[PDB]
Amino acid sequence: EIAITHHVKEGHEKADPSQFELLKVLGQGSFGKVFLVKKISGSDARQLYAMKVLKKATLKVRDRVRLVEVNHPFIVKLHYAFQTEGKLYLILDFLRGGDLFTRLSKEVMFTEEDVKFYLAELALALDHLHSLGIIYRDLKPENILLDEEGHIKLTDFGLSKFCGTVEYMAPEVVNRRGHTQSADWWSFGVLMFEMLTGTLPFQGKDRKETMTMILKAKLGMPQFLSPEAQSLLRMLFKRNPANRLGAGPDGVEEIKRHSFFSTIDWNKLYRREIHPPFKPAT
Amino acid sequence: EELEDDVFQP
Numbered sequence A: 001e002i003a004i005t006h007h008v009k010e011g012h013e014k015a016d017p018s019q020f021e022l023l024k025v026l027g028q029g030s031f032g033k034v035f036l037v038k039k040i041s042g043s044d045a046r047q048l049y050a051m052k053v054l055k056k057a058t059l060k061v062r063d064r065v066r067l068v069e070v071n072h073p074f075i076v077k078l079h080y081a082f083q084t085e086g087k088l089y090l091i092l093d094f095l096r097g098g099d100l101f102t103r104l105s106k107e108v109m110f111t112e113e114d115v116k117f118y119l120a121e122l123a124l125a126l127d128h129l130h131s132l133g134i135i136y137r138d139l140k141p142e143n144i145l146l147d148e149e150g151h152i153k154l155t156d157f158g159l160s161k162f163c164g165t166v167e168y169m170a171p172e173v174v175n176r177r178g179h180t181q182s183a184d185w186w187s188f189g190v191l192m193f194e195m196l197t198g199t200l201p202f203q204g205k206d207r208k209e210t211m212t213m214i215l216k217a218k219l220g221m222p223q224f225l226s227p228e229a230q231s232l233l234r235m236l237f238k239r240n241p242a243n244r245l246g247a248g249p250d251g252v253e254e255i256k257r258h259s260f261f262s263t264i265d266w267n268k269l270y271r272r273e274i275h276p277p278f279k280p281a282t
Numbered sequence B: 001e002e003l004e005d006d007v008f009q010p
Protein backbone atom coordinates (compact mmCIF):
# COMPACT_ATOMS: atom_id res chain seq x y z
CA GLU A 1 0.00 0.00 0.00
CA ILE A 2 0.90 3.70 -0.11
CA ALA A 3 1.88 5.71 2.98
CA ILE A 4 1.19 9.45 2.87
CA THR A 5 2.91 11.45 5.60
CA HIS A 6 1.12 14.80 5.85
CA HIS A 7 3.22 17.57 7.39
CA VAL A 8 0.33 19.75 8.56
CA LYS A 9 0.50 23.36 9.76
CA GLU A 10 -0.04 24.14 13.47
CA GLY A 11 -3.68 25.12 13.94
CA HIS A 12 -4.72 23.97 10.45
CA GLU A 13 -8.07 22.19 10.71
CA LYS A 14 -9.44 19.01 9.15
CA ALA A 15 -11.57 19.01 5.99
CA ASP A 16 -14.76 17.17 4.88
CA PRO A 17 -15.83 15.81 1.43
CA SER A 18 -18.88 18.15 1.39
CA GLN A 19 -16.60 21.19 1.99
CA PHE A 20 -15.40 20.95 -1.66
CA GLU A 21 -17.30 20.53 -4.99
CA LEU A 22 -16.14 18.76 -8.18
CA LEU A 23 -15.70 20.74 -11.44
CA LYS A 24 -13.71 18.35 -13.66
CA VAL A 25 -12.40 14.79 -13.30
CA LEU A 26 -9.42 14.24 -15.60
CA GLY A 27 -6.59 11.85 -16.21
CA GLN A 28 -3.22 13.43 -15.52
CA GLY A 29 -1.60 10.32 -16.95
CA SER A 30 0.53 8.80 -14.19
CA PHE A 31 -1.42 10.84 -11.63
CA GLY A 32 -4.47 8.81 -12.56
CA LYS A 33 -8.03 9.91 -11.94
CA VAL A 34 -7.65 13.45 -10.55
CA PHE A 35 -10.75 15.28 -9.34
CA LEU A 36 -10.51 19.06 -9.71
CA VAL A 37 -12.37 20.75 -6.84
CA LYS A 38 -12.99 24.24 -5.42
CA LYS A 39 -13.39 24.97 -1.73
CA ILE A 40 -16.56 26.27 -0.10
CA SER A 41 -15.21 27.39 3.33
CA GLY A 42 -12.15 28.79 5.09
CA SER A 43 -9.38 30.99 3.72
CA ASP A 44 -8.98 28.56 0.80
CA ALA A 45 -12.65 28.99 -0.15
CA ARG A 46 -12.82 29.47 -3.96
CA GLN A 47 -9.43 27.79 -4.55
CA LEU A 48 -9.03 25.09 -7.19
CA TYR A 49 -7.39 21.97 -5.76
CA ALA A 50 -6.59 18.53 -7.09
CA MET A 51 -8.30 15.70 -5.23
CA LYS A 52 -7.08 12.12 -5.18
CA VAL A 53 -9.29 9.45 -3.61
CA LEU A 54 -7.08 6.49 -2.67
CA LYS A 55 -8.43 3.21 -1.34
CA LYS A 56 -5.27 1.52 0.03
CA ALA A 57 -3.34 4.31 1.73
CA THR A 58 -2.41 5.16 5.31
CA LEU A 59 -2.36 8.80 6.52
CA LYS A 60 0.26 9.81 9.11
CA VAL A 61 -0.02 13.47 10.21
CA ARG A 62 3.36 14.79 11.49
CA ASP A 63 3.23 18.38 12.72
CA ARG A 64 6.02 20.75 11.75
CA VAL A 65 8.96 21.23 14.13
CA ARG A 66 8.72 25.03 13.66
CA LEU A 67 3.22 33.86 9.59
CA VAL A 68 3.13 34.13 5.78
CA GLU A 69 1.93 31.43 3.37
CA VAL A 70 3.63 31.31 -0.03
CA ASN A 71 3.74 29.15 -3.18
CA HIS A 72 7.31 27.98 -3.78
CA PRO A 73 8.09 27.33 -7.47
CA PHE A 74 9.50 23.84 -6.89
CA ILE A 75 7.06 22.38 -4.32
CA VAL A 76 3.56 20.91 -4.53
CA LYS A 77 1.69 20.75 -1.25
CA LEU A 78 -0.88 18.54 0.43
CA HIS A 79 -3.38 21.02 1.89
CA TYR A 80 -5.93 18.61 3.41
CA ALA A 81 -6.05 14.87 3.98
CA PHE A 82 -9.12 13.07 5.34
CA GLN A 83 -10.05 9.38 5.69
CA THR A 84 -13.81 9.11 5.08
CA GLU A 85 -15.88 6.02 4.27
CA GLY A 86 -12.82 3.78 4.02
CA LYS A 87 -11.13 5.97 1.39
CA LEU A 88 -8.17 8.35 1.72
CA TYR A 89 -8.93 11.79 0.26
CA LEU A 90 -5.94 13.98 -0.61
CA ILE A 91 -6.48 17.66 -1.49
CA LEU A 92 -3.28 18.86 -3.19
CA ASP A 93 -2.07 21.61 -5.56
CA PHE A 94 -3.30 21.13 -9.12
CA LEU A 95 -0.21 20.26 -11.18
CA ARG A 96 -1.42 20.58 -14.77
CA GLY A 97 0.59 18.45 -17.17
CA GLY A 98 2.59 17.00 -14.30
CA ASP A 99 4.74 13.91 -14.65
CA LEU A 100 6.96 11.70 -12.50
CA PHE A 101 10.69 12.34 -12.28
CA THR A 102 11.12 8.55 -12.20
CA ARG A 103 9.68 8.48 -15.73
CA LEU A 104 12.36 10.80 -17.10
CA SER A 105 15.01 8.90 -15.11
CA LYS A 106 14.18 5.66 -16.92
CA GLU A 107 13.67 7.10 -20.41
CA VAL A 108 16.63 9.50 -20.67
CA MET A 109 19.99 9.90 -18.96
CA PHE A 110 20.96 13.21 -17.38
CA THR A 111 24.19 15.05 -17.90
CA GLU A 112 25.79 16.54 -14.81
CA GLU A 113 24.40 19.81 -16.20
CA ASP A 114 20.94 18.23 -16.07
CA VAL A 115 21.49 17.00 -12.51
CA LYS A 116 22.62 20.48 -11.44
CA PHE A 117 19.32 21.96 -12.59
CA TYR A 118 17.03 19.46 -10.90
CA LEU A 119 19.15 19.16 -7.75
CA ALA A 120 19.44 22.95 -7.51
CA GLU A 121 15.65 23.27 -7.65
CA LEU A 122 15.26 20.38 -5.21
CA ALA A 123 17.63 22.04 -2.76
CA LEU A 124 15.63 25.28 -2.85
CA ALA A 125 12.48 23.22 -2.29
CA LEU A 126 14.00 21.16 0.53
CA ASP A 127 15.26 24.26 2.33
CA HIS A 128 11.86 25.91 1.96
CA LEU A 129 10.26 22.90 3.66
CA HIS A 130 12.97 22.87 6.33
CA SER A 131 12.20 26.56 6.87
CA LEU A 132 8.55 25.52 7.23
CA GLY A 133 9.44 23.00 9.97
CA ILE A 134 9.35 19.83 7.85
CA ILE A 135 12.06 17.17 8.09
CA TYR A 136 11.71 14.63 5.29
CA ARG A 137 13.74 11.66 6.69
CA ASP A 138 13.03 9.66 3.53
CA LEU A 139 13.29 12.10 0.60
CA LYS A 140 13.24 9.89 -2.48
CA PRO A 141 12.75 10.22 -6.26
CA GLU A 142 9.15 9.11 -5.71
CA ASN A 143 8.69 12.42 -3.83
CA ILE A 144 9.84 14.37 -6.90
CA LEU A 145 7.43 15.50 -9.62
CA LEU A 146 7.74 17.68 -12.71
CA ASP A 147 5.38 20.41 -13.87
CA GLU A 148 4.16 21.15 -17.39
CA GLU A 149 7.25 23.31 -18.11
CA GLY A 150 9.78 20.79 -16.78
CA HIS A 151 10.56 22.31 -13.38
CA ILE A 152 10.93 20.19 -10.27
CA LYS A 153 7.89 19.96 -8.00
CA LEU A 154 8.79 18.41 -4.66
CA THR A 155 5.95 16.93 -2.66
CA ASP A 156 5.66 18.51 0.79
CA PHE A 157 4.17 15.17 1.91
CA GLY A 158 5.76 11.79 2.50
CA LEU A 159 5.13 8.93 0.08
CA SER A 160 6.29 5.42 0.97
CA LYS A 161 5.27 1.90 0.01
CA PHE A 162 7.89 4.75 10.36
CA CYS A 163 7.57 3.17 6.94
CA GLY A 164 10.16 4.82 4.71
CA THR A 165 12.65 3.82 2.05
CA VAL A 166 15.83 2.83 3.88
CA GLU A 167 18.06 3.40 0.83
CA TYR A 168 17.56 7.18 1.12
CA MET A 169 17.81 7.44 4.92
CA ALA A 170 20.84 8.95 6.61
CA PRO A 171 22.71 6.95 9.29
CA GLU A 172 21.19 8.88 12.18
CA VAL A 173 17.67 8.05 10.96
CA VAL A 174 18.58 4.40 10.35
CA ASN A 175 20.05 4.24 13.87
CA ARG A 176 16.72 5.39 15.38
CA ARG A 177 18.87 7.41 17.79
CA GLY A 178 17.89 10.94 16.67
CA HIS A 179 18.00 13.18 13.61
CA THR A 180 17.68 16.77 12.38
CA GLN A 181 17.13 18.48 9.02
CA SER A 182 20.73 17.50 8.20
CA ALA A 183 19.47 13.94 7.64
CA ASP A 184 17.68 15.19 4.53
CA TRP A 185 20.87 16.53 2.92
CA TRP A 186 22.35 13.03 3.06
CA SER A 187 19.32 11.81 1.11
CA PHE A 188 19.91 14.68 -1.33
CA GLY A 189 23.32 13.09 -1.91
CA VAL A 190 21.76 9.65 -2.39
CA LEU A 191 19.51 11.20 -5.04
CA MET A 192 22.55 12.81 -6.66
CA PHE A 193 24.39 9.47 -6.73
CA GLU A 194 21.39 7.73 -8.31
CA MET A 195 20.74 10.56 -10.80
CA LEU A 196 24.39 10.80 -11.86
CA THR A 197 25.27 7.09 -11.62
CA GLY A 198 21.89 5.47 -12.26
CA THR A 199 22.40 3.20 -9.24
CA LEU A 200 21.88 3.51 -5.55
CA PRO A 201 24.90 4.13 -3.31
CA PHE A 202 23.61 1.73 -0.64
CA GLN A 203 21.59 -1.32 -1.63
CA GLY A 204 21.54 -4.87 -0.30
CA LYS A 205 19.29 -7.84 -0.90
CA ASP A 206 17.51 -7.03 2.38
CA ARG A 207 16.88 -4.00 4.55
CA LYS A 208 19.43 -5.17 7.13
CA GLU A 209 22.19 -5.36 4.51
CA THR A 210 21.11 -2.03 3.04
CA MET A 211 21.02 -0.55 6.54
CA THR A 212 24.48 -1.94 7.28
CA MET A 213 25.92 -0.35 4.12
CA ILE A 214 24.53 3.06 5.10
CA LEU A 215 26.13 2.68 8.53
CA LYS A 216 29.43 0.98 7.67
CA ALA A 217 30.14 0.84 3.91
CA LYS A 218 33.17 2.46 2.28
CA LEU A 219 32.25 3.52 -1.23
CA GLY A 220 34.27 3.79 -4.40
CA MET A 221 33.84 7.23 -5.90
CA PRO A 222 32.48 6.89 -9.46
CA GLN A 223 35.37 8.54 -11.23
CA PHE A 224 33.37 9.52 -14.33
CA LEU A 225 31.80 12.24 -12.15
CA SER A 226 33.18 15.77 -12.33
CA PRO A 227 35.51 16.86 -9.51
CA GLU A 228 32.80 19.21 -8.24
CA ALA A 229 30.23 16.41 -8.06
CA GLN A 230 32.73 14.12 -6.34
CA SER A 231 33.44 16.78 -3.72
CA LEU A 232 29.76 17.49 -3.06
CA LEU A 233 29.02 13.79 -2.67
CA ARG A 234 32.05 13.40 -0.40
CA MET A 235 30.85 16.35 1.72
CA LEU A 236 27.17 15.35 1.83
CA PHE A 237 27.89 11.66 2.50
CA LYS A 238 29.31 12.28 5.96
CA ARG A 239 28.00 9.99 8.69
CA ASN A 240 28.48 12.50 11.48
CA PRO A 241 25.68 15.01 10.80
CA ALA A 242 27.87 17.75 12.31
CA ASN A 243 30.41 17.11 9.52
CA ARG A 244 27.76 17.11 6.78
CA LEU A 245 27.34 19.96 4.33
CA GLY A 246 24.07 21.71 5.11
CA ALA A 247 24.06 21.04 8.86
CA GLY A 248 25.41 24.47 9.82
CA PRO A 249 23.37 27.62 10.45
CA ASP A 250 23.36 28.73 6.81
CA GLY A 251 21.77 25.40 5.81
CA VAL A 252 21.37 25.15 2.05
CA GLU A 253 23.77 28.07 1.51
CA GLU A 254 26.59 25.66 2.36
CA ILE A 255 25.38 23.52 -0.54
CA LYS A 256 24.47 26.39 -2.88
CA ARG A 257 28.06 27.63 -2.65
CA HIS A 258 29.64 24.32 -3.59
CA SER A 259 31.62 24.24 -6.81
CA PHE A 260 29.08 21.86 -8.36
CA PHE A 261 26.38 24.55 -8.36
CA SER A 262 28.75 27.36 -9.37
CA THR A 263 26.94 27.76 -12.72
CA ILE A 264 23.51 28.25 -11.12
CA ASP A 265 22.05 31.70 -10.66
CA TRP A 266 19.86 30.70 -7.72
CA ASN A 267 17.90 33.95 -8.09
CA LYS A 268 17.11 33.23 -11.75
CA LEU A 269 16.27 29.65 -10.80
CA TYR A 270 13.67 30.71 -8.21
CA ARG A 271 12.20 33.07 -10.80
CA ARG A 272 11.90 30.05 -13.16
CA GLU A 273 14.11 31.96 -15.61
CA ILE A 274 16.45 29.01 -16.14
CA HIS A 275 14.85 26.71 -18.66
CA PRO A 276 14.58 23.05 -17.69
CA PRO A 277 16.76 20.51 -19.54
CA PHE A 278 13.77 18.52 -20.83
CA LYS A 279 10.42 20.04 -21.72
CA PRO A 280 7.28 17.92 -21.11
CA ALA A 281 4.83 17.34 -23.95
CA THR A 282 2.51 20.25 -24.69
CA GLU B 1 27.44 6.71 15.62
CA GLU B 2 31.12 5.80 16.20
CA LEU B 3 31.17 5.27 12.44
CA GLU B 4 33.40 6.21 9.52
CA ASP B 5 32.21 9.75 8.80
CA ASP B 6 33.69 9.67 5.31
CA VAL B 7 31.75 7.15 3.25
CA PHE B 8 33.60 7.44 -0.05
CA GLN B 9 37.07 5.94 0.01
CA PRO B 10 40.11 8.32 0.07
Ligand SMILES: C[C@@H]1O[C@@H](Oc2c(-c3ccc(O)c(O)c3)oc3cc(O)cc(O)c3c2=O)[C@H](O)[C@H](O)[C@H]1O
Pocket: A002, A028, A030, A031, A032, A033, A034, A050, A051, A052, A076, A077, A090, A092, A093, A094, A095, A100, A141, A142, A143, A144, A145, A155, A159
Ligand atom coordinates in the same frame (compact mmCIF):
# COMPACT_ATOMS: atom_id res chain seq x y z
C1 LIG C 1 -0.87 9.94 -4.22
C2 LIG C 1 -0.59 9.67 -5.67
O1 LIG C 1 -1.65 10.27 -6.43
C3 LIG C 1 -1.51 10.19 -7.83
O2 LIG C 1 -0.35 10.87 -8.26
C4 LIG C 1 -0.16 12.18 -7.88
C5 LIG C 1 1.07 12.54 -7.34
C6 LIG C 1 2.23 11.67 -7.13
C7 LIG C 1 3.26 12.08 -6.29
C8 LIG C 1 4.38 11.29 -6.09
C9 LIG C 1 4.50 10.09 -6.75
O3 LIG C 1 5.61 9.31 -6.56
C10 LIG C 1 3.49 9.67 -7.62
O4 LIG C 1 3.63 8.47 -8.26
C11 LIG C 1 2.37 10.45 -7.81
O5 LIG C 1 1.30 13.83 -6.94
C12 LIG C 1 0.35 14.80 -7.07
C13 LIG C 1 0.71 16.06 -6.63
C14 LIG C 1 -0.24 17.06 -6.73
O6 LIG C 1 0.08 18.32 -6.31
C15 LIG C 1 -1.51 16.82 -7.26
C16 LIG C 1 -1.84 15.55 -7.69
O7 LIG C 1 -3.07 15.27 -8.21
C17 LIG C 1 -0.90 14.50 -7.60
C18 LIG C 1 -1.16 13.14 -8.02
O8 LIG C 1 -2.28 12.84 -8.51
C19 LIG C 1 -1.38 8.74 -8.30
O9 LIG C 1 -2.63 8.08 -8.18
C20 LIG C 1 -0.31 8.02 -7.49
O10 LIG C 1 -0.32 6.64 -7.83
C21 LIG C 1 -0.53 8.19 -6.01
O11 LIG C 1 0.54 7.58 -5.30
